[PDB]
Amino acid sequence: GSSGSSGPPVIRQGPVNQTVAVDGTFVLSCVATGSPVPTILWRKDGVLVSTQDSRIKQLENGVLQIRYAKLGDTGRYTCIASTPSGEATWSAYIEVQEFGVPVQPPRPTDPNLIPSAP
């Protein structure tokens, strides 16, 4: 079959806690060994990342980029490496702070009461 193998996955370097401004851009890279190459995944608040919004895109292998970091994005990102020899993860937190943005109050919504005749 396979004579000799790299071994268990080991994250030599990954994402580190960094501060970013609102509507900014925070990048995260996850490095891990293992043959075949380990699969770098992403999870937000213990949930599978939503790689559907233009905001989140994958430029390279394991390299993810999230543009337009909103205040609601303030979460803890974690990397996951799956391999036929083992699996490892990493810790990383991202904070979003508003700066240079004007007051953005809520939208004027009504209780859906009865309409005004006159």
Summarize the model shown.
This protein has about 120 residues and is mainly beta.
Strand content: 25-35%
- Give the domain tally: 1
H/E series: EEEEEEEE
CATH C-level class is Mainly Beta
Order of neighbouring strands in the sheet with most strands: 2-5-4
CATH topology: Immunoglobulin-like
Q: Give helix % range.
A: under 10%
Q: What is the distance, rounded to the nearest whole angstrom, between the alpha carbons of the first and last residues?
A: 84 Å
* Category by helix and strand content: mainly beta
Largest beta sheet, briefly? 3 strands, antiparallel
Radius of gyration: 21 Å
CATH superfamily: Immunoglobulins
What is the CATH architecture term? Sandwich
Question: Given the structure, what is the number of helices?
Answer: 0
Outline = elongated
Give the number of DSSP strands.
Answer: 8
Subcellular location: Cell membrane; Cell projection, Axon; Endoplasmic reticulum-Golgi intermediate compartment membrane
Protein name: Roundabout homolog 1
Subunit structure: Homodimer. Dimerization is mediated by the extracellular domain and is independent of SLIT liganding. Interacts with SLIT1. Interacts with SLIT2. Interacts with FLRT3. Interacts with MYO9B (via Rho-GAP domain).
Family: Belongs to the immunoglobulin superfamily. ROBO family.
